[PDB]
Design an enzyme around this catalytic site. Structure first.
Site, PDB file in Angstrom:
ATOM      1  CG  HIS B  41      -1.554   3.958   4.058  1.00 17.06           C
ATOM      2  ND1 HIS B  41      -0.814   2.954   3.511  1.00 17.06           N
ATOM      3  CD2 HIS B  41      -2.276   3.584   5.145  1.00 17.06           C
ATOM      4  CE1 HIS B  41      -1.088   1.820   4.323  1.00 17.06           C
ATOM      5  NE2 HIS B  41      -1.815   2.106   4.849  1.00 17.06           N
ATOM      6  N   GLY B 143      -6.784  -3.200   8.918  1.00 16.35           N
ATOM      7  CA  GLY B 143      -5.833  -2.635  10.226  1.00 16.35           C
ATOM      8  C   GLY B 143      -4.677  -3.276  10.362  1.00 16.35           C
ATOM      9  CB  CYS B 145      -1.666  -0.721   7.771  1.00 16.24           C
ATOM     10  SG  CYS B 145      -2.914  -0.639   6.091  1.00 16.24           S
TER      11      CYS B 145
END
Ligand SMILES: *[C@@H](CC(=O)OC)C(=O)N(c1ccccc1)c1cncc(Cl)c1
Ligand SMILES: *[C@@H](CC(=O)OC)C(=O)N(c1ccccc1)c1cncc(Cl)c1
Lengths: 306, 306
Positions: B41, B143, B145
């Site tokens: 993503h 952030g 991820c």
């Protein structure tokens, strides 16, 4: 969101851990530049750790009595000296992995990460607080002597703890990195014991704010209280006094949540007098006191280290 | 002695964390040999993460749309591909800090360490379990991820988790390192939610054994129970079933403490039916289920990693 007991990344410290052997005694050392730091009781044997004279014991040693292993590589010891309760072994090689570091002594109530080590090899990392009675509730087995505690500020490792011993209640005692014990403990075998502890009030309040940030609000109420009236209650439940500087330190967390510090104190008061009545706060059924206001801001806001 | 939620030393993983930027989206990547792994993503924008076609989105990108920063050093991307929900960015430089590693998928009930990261910079390390409902109760902000979870076996890093998203209850969902989600979650913005959870029974028993090893014995009793009669009680308190293989896995801890597994089950039964009546076990007022039998043996016996 979420809230965990979170330690600092340990890699900068992993690169400093070595194994120190004197006679039949092996423990962990900390290798910074060309010095290896370790508990001085490495020079003691079984009968020595009874009532030892460390100056007498050390003058009988030579550099060659100290074997230092940095992984599968042996470091030649070229000098030795005693600084309070730690040994300083001068080696011929500076550690190329030396981070930027400081030796700092912490206050009861502050937290740090522990890199538990055995035979110079890191085993695990976890977060600890310095208890008001200068012990720490660690996790240490035989051979963990010399494992260090630390904090990281951007790229700088602030070493604050070196592990020495376990006390009879299962808690742990050690020194700062200048060899000065935290609390009234000595590196001999006596009947020394922890001594009475208190709960770190400002940390509990910080953790209550962490809970509100994370959506636990059931313990909030409309009442307030005065600082004096709260501190009367803290006394009765073995909490230590809250000061105006604690209130000031809690200011940012107050302003982020919109809950006045003294209102949170009213909430804490109610929790002490009533318990939690089957509910939890941040997955705990106890009031948690090993997060500082800084720990909460760091975790609920997101500061890294490089 | 003592018992802490203890993570693996993180240094071997710190050396693999990089920052990946595509457009205005920045997250964390994992750099092993000449490949950087990250959530797919990263190629999505705000309106894209609604209902995206990732194959359509990716064919529109070029290598130059991916900026990879390894610290203050930029890595040139020379290939890209999609593997399930992760991106594989081929870079021109192999990571000289690549540890020995594996990609392994874990089972609900097993634990791992999380190196929480922001902008490619490690922030903190903590221990997590895979919940029965395939979520994890982590601590992650915007952030995070691309932060990974892992275990270490001697010198080998077994990567098991890459963080993707937070669910509405504040828990976390992600993939293994082949890009296959844990549980019934997707990398789009839907109304997906965790789904009902259970308590990991074998882990609670392991932690009770950890407590006995550490001197908490108040919850022991002379009664025993059968496996069938215990599992009837586990059902009623939302505990998952105990199997004969669980009993076998608890064998070493049974033999070290001299408490038969089925006797510990009787103790757990009593604790479920009566609560703890104001007492604690290993500093907790709740039955703790995020330590495996292995975690207990590792910590109460002392195995390191090199
Ligand atoms: C270190 C003991 C040592 O240097 O010999 C291998 C050690 O880890 N000790 C310890 C300290 C004092 C006396 C005996 C043993 C230790 C530390 N923490 C916990 C436990 Cl159980 C032992
Ligand atoms: C990563 C978001 C990203 O790649 O943009 C900077 C991230 O950490 N996210 C996240 C996931 C999905 C949609 C939005 C944001 C995240 C992960 N864990 C917790 C939280 Cl609060 C956000």
């Amino acid at each position: 969101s979420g809230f965990r007991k979170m330690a600092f990344p340990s890699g900068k410290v992993e690169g400093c851990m070595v194994q120190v052997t004197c006679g039949t005694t092996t423990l962990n050392g900390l290798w910074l530049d060309d010095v290896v730091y370790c508990p001085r009781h490495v020079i003691c044997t079984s009968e020595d750790m009874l009532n030892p004279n460390y100056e007498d014991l050390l003058i009988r040693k030579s550099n060659h009595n100290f074997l230092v292993q940095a992984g599968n590589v042996q470091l030649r010891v070229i000098g030795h000296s005693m600084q309070n309760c730690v040994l300083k072994l001068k080696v011929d090689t500076a550690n190329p992995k030396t981070p930027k570091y400081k030796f700092v002594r912490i206050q009861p109530g502050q937290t740090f990460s522990v890199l538990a080590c055995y035979n110079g090899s890191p085993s695990g990392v976890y977060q600890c607080a310095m208890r008001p009675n200068f012990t720490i509730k660690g996790s240490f087995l035989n051979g963990s002597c010399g494992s260090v505690g630390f904090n990281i500020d951007y790229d700088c490792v602030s070493f604050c703890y070196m592990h020495h011993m376990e006390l009879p209640t299962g808690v742990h005692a050690g020194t700062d990195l200048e060899g000065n014990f935290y609390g009234p403990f000595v590196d001999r075998q006596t009947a020394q014991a922890a001594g009475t502890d208190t709960t770190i009030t400002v940390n509990v309040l910080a953790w209550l704010y962490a809970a509100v940030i994370n959506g636990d609000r059931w313990f909030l109420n409309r009442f307030t209280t005065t600082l004096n009236d709260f501190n009367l209650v803290a006394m009765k439940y073995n909490y230590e006094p809250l000061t105006q500087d604690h209130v000031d330190i809690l200011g940012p967390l107050s302003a982020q949540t919109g809950i006045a510090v003294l209102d949170m104190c009213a909430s804490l008061k109610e929790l002490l007098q009533n318990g939690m009545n089957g509910r939890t706060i941040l997955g705990s059924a106890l009031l948690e006191d090993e997060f500082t206001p800084f720990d909460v801001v760091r975790q609920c806001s997101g500061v890294t280290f490089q």
